[PDB]
């Protein structure tokens, strides 16, 4: 809470400089060689790391470290400005660490890609870094609300070749940005729509349903003549099925195609006339088709338009839609600022099993005076603090109990926060094929022998009794 308040105020007080002298922003960059013996506006810090058995790594309490992924340049005017204004977060980092000496990490994900964590430690050691703070599960949890996503893949003849491979990879990467609270189904349509996999209505994005969808997408072949009015009339109908369980909010449609001629006004006027379903249109591949109807489709219905001409753009274009989804919660005001705890997952910096509390940081530039609200509808980032499962285990002593006795905790989804059977290993998703990022989610019924009484007990604990 206090970190978010300070970050909001510091952003409110910032001035958008453009001319940066060679030494105006000072930071560590958390990825530089400690012994270079040697930039456009930045001056590096040579810090001192001694040791800390609480982390196992070598850390510095004097300042925070900044991680900037490989793709994003660190000399851009959009990155230098944040590297300047986020420098005020170090004082609050130190204050929190001195008030509670048991704090492990205090990360501030940013909408541009950089992450600032207080204990200055070098990043994880072809060793190329594909880490992006805007795709981690805690950031995704804290940047939007549970979704009802229905990916609509174009499988006509024209998407054959490179376009099909790019579409498959993009769909897989989009599926990777989904939590257990999110429900997703993947459909396809050349001339008549059909479900890509055995699922027919909607499935929650577990680690297994996602693999099923990914395999079914990778089995897709392209043949036929595009018919938008039969694919959208199918997507909107599977978004109306209420016999099954769903997140029941943020009903969004993903259209993966190349380009066309039909805008299908009748289908939208028939199904979505009050505009309760968002539409995101993707123009995948390198071609010269008419990218006109899909932009209008993403404009008339709430949504945004993306272009994926290569493998590099896949990650950013698939991750960007959270920025669009985040507008209602920031417009809600100081009511969406609720701390949410993620599922148990292996820490990126190798602390083992942890859970992160997430608080969104809103844009309050010109809040006092009602002048500017156009760009205030996008989040600045997500704050995050990590608590290790070792702390929760220490809060529950077991040596007064018999060895057969133990403690366990259940979240609403039914996964175990604490359990003796739970181990720091990724969940097995299937038989290993011949020739850490995923959350560790183990159900209560999958950690012990399933019994009739243990299901009723699980339901009662989920209800909160």
């Amino acid at each position: 809470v206090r970190l978010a308040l300070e970050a909001e105020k510091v952003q409110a007080a910032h001035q958008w400089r453009e001319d940066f002298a060679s030494n105006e922003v000072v930071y560590y960059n958390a990825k530089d060689d400690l012994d270079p013996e040697k930039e456009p506006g930045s001056q590096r810090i040579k810090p001192v790391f001694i040791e800390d058995a609480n982390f196992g790594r070598q850390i510095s309490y004097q300042h925070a470290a900044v991680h900037i992924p490989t793709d994003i340049y660190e000399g851009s005017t959009i990155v230098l400005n944040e590297l300047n204004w986020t420098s005020a977060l170090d004082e609050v980092f130190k204050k929190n660490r001195e008030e509670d000496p048991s704090l492990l990490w205090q990360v501030f994900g940013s909408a541009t890609g950089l992450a600032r964590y207080y204990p200055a430690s070098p990043w994880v050691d072809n060793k190329i870094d594909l880490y992006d703070v805007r795709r981690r599960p805690w950031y995704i949890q804290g940047a939007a609300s549970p979704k009802d996503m229905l990916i609509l893949v174009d499988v006509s003849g024209s998407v054959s070749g490179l376009t099909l491979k790019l579409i498959r990879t993009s769909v897989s990467e989009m599926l990777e940005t989904l939590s257990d609270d999110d429900f997703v189904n993947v459909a396809s349509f050349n001339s008549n729509a059909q479900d890509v996999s055995c699922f027919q209505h909607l499935v929650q994005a577990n680690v297994r349903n996602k693999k099923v969808l990914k395999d079914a997408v990778n089995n897709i072949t392209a043949k036929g003549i595009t018919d938008y009015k039969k694919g959208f009339s199918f997507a909107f109908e599977q978004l109306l099925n209420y016999n099954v369980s769903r997140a029941n909010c943020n009903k969004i449609i993903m259209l993966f195609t190349d380009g066309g001629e039909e805008r299908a006004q009748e289908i939208f006027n028939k199904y979505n006339k009050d505009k309760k379903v968002r539409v995101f249109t993707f123009s995948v591949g390198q071609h010269n088709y008419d990218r006109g109807p899909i932009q209008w489709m993403a404009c008339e219905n709430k949504g945004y338009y993306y272009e994926i001409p290569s493998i590099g753009a896949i990650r950013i274009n698939t991750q960007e839609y959270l920025d669009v989804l985040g507008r209602p919660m920031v417009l809600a005001g100081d009511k969406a600022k609720q701390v949410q705890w993620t599922n148990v997952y292996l820490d990126a910096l190798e602390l083992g099993l942890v859970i992160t509390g997430t608080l969104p940081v809103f844009n309050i530039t010109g809040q006092f005076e009602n002048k500017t609200n156009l760009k205030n509808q996008l989040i600045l980032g997500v704050m995050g603090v990590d608590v290790s499962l070792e702390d929760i285990k220490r809060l529950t002593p077991r040596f007064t109990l018999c060895p057969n006795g133990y403690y366990f905790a259940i979240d609403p989804n039914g996964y175990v926060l604490l359990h003796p059977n739970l181990q720091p290993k990724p969940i097995g998703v299937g038989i290993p094929t011949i020739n850490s990022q995923e959350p560790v989610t183990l159900d209560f019924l999958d950690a012990e022998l399933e019994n009739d009484i243990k299901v009723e007990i699980r339901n009662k604990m989920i209800d909160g009794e």
Partner: peptide, 9 residues
């Protein structure tokens, strides 16, 4: 909803 993207590209 005026930032739809097509216009800004």
């Amino acid at each position: 909803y005026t930032d739809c993207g097509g216009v800004s590209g």
